[PDB]
């Protein structure tokens, strides 16, 4: 059966199943999926472009811009001009956003550890390395 070992189907199912487990925790802590993705992606990061944020959060850019309108209104993120290009807007998490998301990030790390524990450190690191290499080869 083609679909049983078709890579894009395997990636999508694993991603949906693992993510859906953590989304229940995020909601119990008052976060939407998109708010969790944005704050977790900006935590501990230097300011990044809207386009970079859209790529790492797998969210369409117009959706990200609307999300940032409301997250900035709530003081959780800040948009700022690029030091050179008028075309580029950068975005950062604020202290308020970081404090709001820190505990959830620790829960996310615990959930990830539980997901990866049956595989062992070797297989877990190999998976993460392969995924990172694939992203870096296919990102635009």
- Please pick, from the candidates 40, 54, 68, 101, the single residue that binds ligand WOM as defined by CB under 6 A: 40
| Contact assessment for residue 79 and residue 129, using Cβ atoms and an 8 Å cutoff | no
- Please pick, from the candidates 1, 4, 24, 58, the single residue that binds ligand WOM as defined by CB under 6 A: 58
Q: What is the DSSP letter of 76?
A: S
| Contact assessment for residue 68 and residue 79, using Cβ atoms and an 8 Å cutoff | yes
**SS3 category, 140:** coil
Q: What is the DSSP letter of 88?
A: -
Cβ distance to a second copy smaller for residue 14 or 88: 14
Site for ligand WOM in 20-39 (CB under 6 A): 22, 33, 37
Other beta carbons within 10 Å of 40: 19
> Least distance (Å) from a second copy to the CB of residue 86?
27
Instruction: Give contact residues for ligand WOM (rule: CB under 6 A).
Output: 3, 6, 8-9, 12-13, 19, 22, 33, 37, 40-41, 56-58
Annotated binding residues for (indol-3-yl)acetate = 19, 23, 37
């Amino acid at each position: 059966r083609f679909v049983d070992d078709y890579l894009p189907a395997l990636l999508a199912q694993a991603s949906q199943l693992i993510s859906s487990e953590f989304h229940e925790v995020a909601r119990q802590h008052g976060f939407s999926v998109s708010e969790w993705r944005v704050m977790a992606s900006l935590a501990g990061s230097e300011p990044i472009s809207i386009g970079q944020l859209a790529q790492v959060t797998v969210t369409k850019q117009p959706t990200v811009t609307r999300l940032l309108d409301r997250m900035e209104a709530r003081g959780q993120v800040e948009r700022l001009p690029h030091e050179s290009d008028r075309r580029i807007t950068l975005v950062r998490i604020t202290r308020k956003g970081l404090k709001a998301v820190e505990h959830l990030m620790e829960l996310a790390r615990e959930h990830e550890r539980r997901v990866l524990e049956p595989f062992g450190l070797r297989r877990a690191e190999e998976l993460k390395q392969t995924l990172r290499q694939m992203i870096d080869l296919h990102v635009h």
